[PDB]
Design a protein around this ligand. Structure first.
Ligand SMILES: OC[C@@H]1O[C@@H](O)[C@@H](O)[C@H](O)[C@@H]1O
Ligand SMILES: [Ca+2]
Length: 562
């Protein structure tokens, strides 16, 4: 078509790409790991890699259960992947009942098997296994369901996923079998780092095939979101990935659709949507991001003996995620025959029921001045979210929408909470106009005090898990300051919300070690903004004396040591 607004570099993409509003408004999507690995249903979806590692538990399990590596390899699961009870409409009904707004089936995982109608990859679900275009059928059901269709690609790791099959007698050593990839060594680098060391993680043919892979996905299914696994960020792969990004963003312009890319590291927060695997953020992040996590604690694909999270665990993390500008991409793992388990069906249905009542606080919302208050901050970071926090009613998460304030208690109480973030020191002319709990017909009795807004819970729980107060208020509110260390100084970050219908001007003052920095800020009516300040010539960050002022009212001082 010739559309070439986007060139294959980060400056070009940053000049013209904007994370779309639909992703910020959507908040919630369903991930679905399903493939050949679902047949053995043992360990996890990494079965293909570990079965060829002689001595590994999965290897020893496979030899006894299915046979030696030379007689029964991973490819030999494919005839057993018949998917006799797969029905795209049934999957979409479950996703829709969860309240999710977009769906991300796995188009191809690490194992080499394309779950779509591929041209270059003969190991695909149209010619083999299910003998149907799983991705295509899901795309169709998604459109009828009225949701947005995405998909994930994990093919970058296929270059090295089968490396151990070269080090022991196996069918992987037959290099004419393209399913098993380039058989390279795993790239070096611990965790979410672009460093690859002595093993690049890809080669010329795998990069060429990656582009063939993404191009046909783009061209055939026009997904509104493409999610990529961690290795696309390794340094030797980045030129190839930027080629993909420009082609996707250019194609999207032709579609009159705005699209989303997910990576876990290696690319700027502003040119794609940052994603954290099995973990969330501890702070409000400037740019929209995504937690992708599984209902199963052990695995993404179905495996016998999976320990599924509770709805309370997931919904508490969900609210925490949304309060910090994040989306939740929640994974289910259906049985090999195409059946979503009843436990994971129940988890999604419970979330959907909660969202039916409390969705006004979630859909279309944005972070407030501060995401959370209370004693229990919760988990944060890569591979931390299997731990469940024991929240109280005092653990509160905030969102905002249409100038309304939503304060979500992560547990119940027969008494009252006090919203400390509305304490008088953070406020200027804050007047509470109304308080209600979503889904409750009981008039909420509340009282503004110097320590914050005291709110008494109603008699009856509208829902379990989490409970939402909708607050209409005027006035200006500032967050407590966040201090970050830099060279010879410190960075101060607050957020200010003007809930008034009139424009407001606001003065913030940071006094650090005698150095006084001030900024006057014009905040339009019914708006909020970041305010970053810097105190320089600070000789010791650990020994700082700090005072912060909101229009000459003391908001914070670090009166206590270290
Ligand atoms: O975020 C999803 C997860 O990403 C990677 O860790 C994969 O190796 C794993 O199988 C799963 O897909
Ligand atoms: Ca809870």
């Amino acid at each position: 078509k010739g559309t070439d607004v986007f060139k294959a570099d980060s400056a070009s993409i940053a000049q013209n790409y904007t994370i779309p509003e639909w992703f910020k408004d959507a908040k919630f999507g369903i991930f679905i790991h399903w493939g050949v690995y679902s047949v053995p249903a043992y360990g996890s979806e990494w079965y293909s890699r570990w079965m060829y590692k002689e001595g590994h538990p999965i290897n020893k399990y496979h030899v006894q259960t299915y046979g030696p590596l030379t007689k029964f390899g991973y490819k030999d699961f494919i005839p057993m992947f018949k998917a006799e009870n797969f029905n795209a409409d049934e999957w979409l009904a479950v996703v829709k009942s969860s309240g999710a707004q977009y769906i991300v089936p796995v188009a191809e995982h690490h194992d080499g098997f394309a779950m779509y109608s591929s041209t270059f990859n003969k190991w695909n679900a149209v010619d083999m296994g299910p003998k149907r275009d799983i991705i295509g059928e899901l795309k169709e059901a998604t459109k009828k369901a009225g949701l947005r269709f995405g998909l994930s690609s994990h093919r970058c790791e296929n270059a090295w996923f089968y490396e151990y099959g070269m080090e022991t007698p196996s069918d992987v050593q037959d290099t004419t079998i393209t399913l098993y990839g380039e058989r390279l060594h795993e790239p070096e680098g611990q965790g979410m780092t672009p460093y690859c060391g002595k093993y690049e993680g890809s080669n010329e043919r795998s990069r060429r095939q990656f582009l063939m892979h993404t191009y046909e996905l783009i061209d055939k299914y026009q997904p509104e979101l493409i999610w990529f696994d961690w290795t696309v960020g390794k340094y030797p792969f980045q030129p190839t990935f930027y080629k993909f990004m420009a082609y996707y963003y250019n194609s999207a312009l032709d579609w009159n659709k705005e699209v989303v890319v997910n990576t876990k590291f290696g690319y700027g927060d502003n040119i794609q949507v940052f994603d954290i695997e099995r973990g969330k953020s501890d702070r409000i992040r400037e740019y929209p991001w995504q937690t992708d996590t599984s209902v199963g604690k052990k695995s993404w694909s179905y495996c016998v003996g999976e320990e599924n999270k509770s709805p309370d665990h997931i919904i508490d993390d969900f609210v925490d995620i949304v309060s910090k500008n994040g989306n939740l991409l929640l994974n289910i793992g259906p049985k090999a025959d195409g059946t979503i388990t009843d436990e994971q069906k129940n988890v999604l249905a419970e979330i959907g029921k909660w969202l039916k009542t409390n969705g006004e606080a979630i859909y279309g919302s944005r972070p407030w001045v501060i995401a959370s208050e209370g004693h229990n901050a919760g988990t944060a970071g890569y591979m931390t979210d299997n731990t469940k926090t024991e929240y109280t009613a005092d653990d509160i998460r905030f969102t905002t929408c249409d100038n309304n304030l939503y304060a979500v208690s992560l547990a119940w109480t027969d008494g009252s909470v006090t919203i400390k973030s509305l304490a008088t020191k953070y406020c200027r002319n804050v007047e509470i106009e109304s308080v209600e709990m979503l889904g409750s017909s009981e008039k909420i009795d509340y009282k503004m005090t110097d320590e914050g807004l005291v709110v008494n819970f109603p008699k009856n729980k509208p829902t379990e898990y989490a409970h939402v107060f909708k607050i209409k208020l005027k006035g200006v509110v500032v967050s407590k300051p966040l201090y970050d260390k830099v060279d010879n100084g410190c960075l101060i970050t607050v957020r200010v919300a003007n809930h008034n219908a009139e424009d407001a001007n606001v003065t913030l003052k940071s006094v650090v070690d005698g150095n006084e920095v001030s900024t006057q800020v014009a905040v339009k009516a019914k708006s909020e903004q970041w305010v970053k300040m810097q105190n320089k010539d600070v000789k010791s960050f650990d020994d700082m004396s700090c005072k912060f002022y909101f229009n000459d009212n003391l908001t914070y001082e670090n009166e206590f040591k270290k």
